[PDB]
Design a protein around this ligand. Structure first.
Ligand SMILES: COC(=O)c1c(C)cc(Oc2cc(C)cc(O)c2O)cc1O
Ligand SMILES: COC(=O)c1c(C)cc(Oc2cc(C)cc(O)c2O)cc1O
Ligand SMILES: [Zn+2]
Ligand SMILES: [Zn+2]
Lengths: 180, 176
């Protein structure tokens, strides 16, 4: 009888992995896109609370939306010229593309779905920090909403907070994950 | 109407010094079948599986993939873990055991109501050669690069239906 799923063994998982085709050698994971209801709240949260930098604001009037690219970069590295700024922004690794469909911030019946309740899909973005505890102590002092405090529940030492739209953000210390 | 630049810039605070070494480490997506997903992300897109973590008590596995050289991955478990979790731009694929055997199950990609997450995106040197190879490998498309007014920008889908943007940073300015 078909065994109940126990997931994959490490051997089977790596057995399904192919080495990269030479044609993909320069590919890079550039962005994760999330739709946001109110850029005023989101920009304040990602820059003031999390410390990211707004790289570029792109407006598409014909389509009634704007894109806000945030990333952990030094503001002084951002080229000034719009064309120069654009090519740099899109070649940075690990950016967050926040999509603002005009008008949602004034529509009291509108809200986006964070992927963690029916129907599920996307789960969270995650930020590596040197100390989850001191980072979360500061988030508490700043009124950040928590999904999981570091010492609460499962996986102690790991925390989850949420942004203005309710998207979950994992806060982790890379050097302590191994000891759960 | 949208925000004026002034309004948006005024909502941006300079980074607090305590956040100086923070990094955006991962994006997590739930996946139905790890065999299909791992084949897709490694053989088609060229990412490398850095590490796999299992949690039997909760019946799920985590797969961490990134654009890294496999020869750089530390051999010892604890060193490997610290390394994986300190890489920027990794993709965490969560496999809740059993979904691969449920014909009535599929994850929601965020692009149909209720919307939220939209896509991850890969920067490449030539969107057209990349997509020609994707097409030849049987990859499904949401938007081919030459379709629509936003030319030279494509969206493909992974085995679960999640959207993946394929863009050329040097050619983006022409469609903004
Ligand atoms: C009750 O469930 C959880 O608390 C939980 C779940 C279900 C999953 C989880 O996944 C991860 C575990 C670890 C160790 C690292 C990650 O980046 C993760 O996304 C972490 C968690 O704390
Ligand atoms: C007509 O609709 C679209 O095709 C489209 C829309 C509506 C938005 C869109 O957003 C982006 C535009 C650009 C220039 C870069 C990105 O990473 C984007 O996510 C890209 C698109 O191709
Ligand atoms: Zn995008
Ligand atoms: Zn995670």
């Amino acid at each position: 009888p078909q065994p109940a799923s126990s997931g994959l063994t490490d051997e089977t998982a790596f057995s399904c992995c192919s080495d990269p085709d030479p044609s993909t050698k320069d590919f890079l994971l550039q962005q994760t896109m999330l739709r946001i209801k109110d850029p005023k709240k989101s920009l304040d949260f990602y820059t003031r609370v999390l410390g990211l930098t707004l790289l570029q604001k792109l407006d598409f009037p014909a389509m009634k939306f704007s894109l806000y690219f945030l990333a952990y970069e030094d503001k002084n590295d951002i080229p000034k010229d719009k064309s120069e700024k654009t090519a740099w922004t899109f070649s940075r690794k690990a950016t967050l593309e926040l999509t603002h469909n005009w008008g949602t911030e004034d529509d009291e019946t509108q809200s986006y779905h964070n992927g963690n309740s029916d129907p599920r899909g996307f789960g969270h973005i995650g930020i590596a920090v040197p100390d989850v505890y001191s980072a979360c102590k500061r988030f508490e002092e700043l009124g950040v909403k928590f999904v999981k405090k570091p010492d609460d529940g499962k996986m102690k030492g790991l925390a989850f907070i949420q942004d203005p739209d309710g998207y979950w953000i994992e806060i982790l210390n890379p050097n302590k994950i191994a000891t759960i």
